[PDB]
Amino acid sequence: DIEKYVEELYKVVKKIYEKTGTPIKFWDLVPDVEPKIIARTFLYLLFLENMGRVEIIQEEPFGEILVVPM
Amino acid sequence: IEKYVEELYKVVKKIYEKTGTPIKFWDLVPDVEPKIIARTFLYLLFLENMGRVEIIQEEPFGEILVVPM
Amino acid sequence: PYIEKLELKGFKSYGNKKVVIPFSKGFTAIVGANGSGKSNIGDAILFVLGGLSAKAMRASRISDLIFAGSKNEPPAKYAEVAIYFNNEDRGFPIDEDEVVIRRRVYPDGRSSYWLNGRRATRSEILDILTAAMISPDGYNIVLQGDITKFIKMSPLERRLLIDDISGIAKEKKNVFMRTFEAISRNFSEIFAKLSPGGSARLILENPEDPFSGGLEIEAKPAGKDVKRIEAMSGGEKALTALAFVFAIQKFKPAPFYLFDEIDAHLDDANVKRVADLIKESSKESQFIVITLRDVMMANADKIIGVSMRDGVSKVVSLSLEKAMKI
Amino acid sequence: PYIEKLELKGFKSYGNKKVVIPFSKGFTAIVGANGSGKSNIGDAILFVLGGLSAKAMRASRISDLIFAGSKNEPPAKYAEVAIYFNNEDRGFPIDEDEVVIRRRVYPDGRSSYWLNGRRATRSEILDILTAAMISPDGYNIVLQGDITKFIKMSPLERRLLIDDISGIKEKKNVFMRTFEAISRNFSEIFAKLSPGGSARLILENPEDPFSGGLEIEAKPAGKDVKRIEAMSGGEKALTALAFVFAIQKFKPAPFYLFDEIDAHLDDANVKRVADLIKESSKESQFIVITLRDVMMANADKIIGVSMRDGVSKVVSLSLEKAM
């Protein structure tokens, strides 16, 4: 379900951060390169931010998107 | 996301191109999971609406059969 | 009691040949493409229970509910709907396991009712229904667009709803408060579950003399700061209305709930949360839910597939329960 | 003209820090969870373009639009929205490649406006807007519930809408001219939105148009008519959308704002509607708030809305540059 895809994506963010100690690039978070997949990943991150699970960082409009787990 | 509906009509016009008889719903749902068995069902309903197929069921909750057109 | 099945003949978009629609004792999702006739199934239920408003069923006159013909069919001579209730729990003051109610409307606008085969008056039908906690005007029936009613309605109309759930209505104040406090807790509990991080509650305008005042809703989606339910967005309003409905059913489960796309404005996460709330509740009440959302139908015990074939609605019943065993 | 961006400060749920919301020249989908602040972006646009009805912007009174503070932020001192219009097509009677309108309201309800830096009056802003043919509340703005309106709308109200779009002896000829066009657009667009079906616009008094209303005759999936009042939510939505698009195909408005107009559409219809929005994106700008995967996956750019302790924020993504 959707309740799962979000929890998995969160674990993926946590795991990477637990090793790099630096904000994750949105790109390295999107599996396949297709509008449908990109947007779904984007959407889930938005959901995780609402949940106070992650923090999304962007310096300028349409600029690079970075993610940091809470 | 209407390709999934079109590819479903394919396997229906194929299992019928041979068998020449009404396709059992069971033989159309890939993974034995609630979410998938429900989508397969929805897509067939969509097909019937378009005029692609025709769903057959003799009694409530009975056996479902699909005949293309 | 619960609905075992519906039988439609010459009713709206369902043509002339009798159509049988089976329902799970629990959670049933009614799905299909737009314009298939899913909503009309809700109208059929409203119709058999004595609904008088043609407008509510999307018709100019009650007579317009009669199938008017299609590509391959002539107009019906009348519309008839039969509803079969399982009465094993004796919710109906009739010593039978099956209670059948049937209504038929003619072109002249007259209706004939039948109670287990014996002709009955609409009044006789309404009374028998009242006895079983069922009504065409019940809060348990939520047609498309009604969702917000449990928001836009007046605090007085709201309290009146609770008056109904409490009892015949002194010593009454005691019964009311008892009912009010439980539902209020259910409301807060459920709203929190639906809107994680938030809270909400029911408030009487006059605690000492409840009956001289109304019943208000105080929501805090954010959790700390209050928010007028009218400042909310579509999804928030839907969640608030739904939490209220479920708050009542958790206290006094109604025989069945009819929802028509109450998930139109909910996001996927909330559709899931509401679907879970429905599954858990369908253990004490029957739930018939029309939906266009995949997450919602996927959580159903049984599914009613509605499709249109030549301008005539058709149905296919699938039981995920007895389908997995294959 | 077309909206390049919006900047919010102390406006509703967006807190104090300036929030920059950019828009695609074409199709932008505004997404995010329930209660995130998505619809508030639509209210922001109603606000800058002169909106006067508190209720229309989901507020008890105008001052209610001022962010009231949160866990980490204090009550804003005022609510402000600035909208940036690309004016390369010179739609505005201003010889500048960028027109900027800004409105601010204080706790006492007093609003102040500015046009390209110089302060203007509300009337002046409306005149400049009508001049660019931008309606703050025209048929081009479809908020939640506006579809149940294009449906409940009386035949006279509906024809009056066309009178307006036509531009007011020989006036009948002008009206008929634009009506014949929009009517044709409606039939073509509806057929596409409802395969196997058709629909058309009909004048009650075709010989003397202004004496009657403008009705809709729909044959959804078949050749059998059906009062629009008798359709279900889904078909009503499509029908309203076909009408809206039939108008835009004839006279493209600078921009269209849609707030969950797909709430009652099945997935195949979300797809058809989405494709119609893209194709229309070539002549007008489309800002669409949606909760549907299908609608979102089809947009050029996406504006993601999320909260943070009662405070909204956005993140902009370009599906093109994401490839």
Q: Care to describe what's here?
A:
It is classed as dna binding protein. Chain A has 70 residues and is an alpha+beta fold. Helices cover 50% and strands 14% of the residues of chain A. A three-stranded antiparallel beta sheet of chain A has the order 1-3-2. In chain A, a hairpin with an 8-residue loop joins strand 2 and strand 3 (66-69). With 326 residues, chain C is of the alpha/beta class. Chain C has helices at 38-48, 122-131, 149-152, 155-166, 172-194, 234-251, 268-281, 294-298, and strands at residues 2-9, 19-22, 27-31, 79-86, 98-105, 111-115, 118-120, 141-142, 199-204, 215-220, 256-260, 286-290, 302-308, 313-319. A six-stranded antiparallel beta sheet of chain C has the order 2-1-4-5-6-7. Chain C is globular. The two termini of chain C are 31 Å apart. Classes of the chains: A alpha+beta (70), C alpha/beta (326). At the C-D interface, helix 1, helix 6 and helix 7 of C face helix 6 and helix 7 of D.
Tags for this model:
heterotetramer; A: 70 residues; alpha+beta; Arc Repressor Mutant, subunit A; three-stranded antiparallel sheet; 2 helices; 3 strands; 14% strand; C: 326 residues; alpha/beta; Rossmann fold; six-stranded antiparallel sheet; six-stranded mixed sheet; 30% helix
Mind telling me the C-alpha Rg of chain C? 20 Å
Query: Secondary-structure element order of chain A, as H and E?
Result: HEHEE
> Given the structure, what is the number of helices of chain C?
8
Mind summarizing the main beta sheet of chain A?
Answer: 3 strands, antiparallel
Strand composition percent of chain A: 5-15%
CATH class of chain C: Alpha Beta
Write down the overall geometry of chain C.
Answer: globular
CATH architecture of chain A: Orthogonal Bundle
Subcellular location (chain D): Cytoplasm
Binding site for ATP (chain D): 33-40
Subunit structure (chain D): Homodimer.
Family (chain D): Belongs to the SMC family.
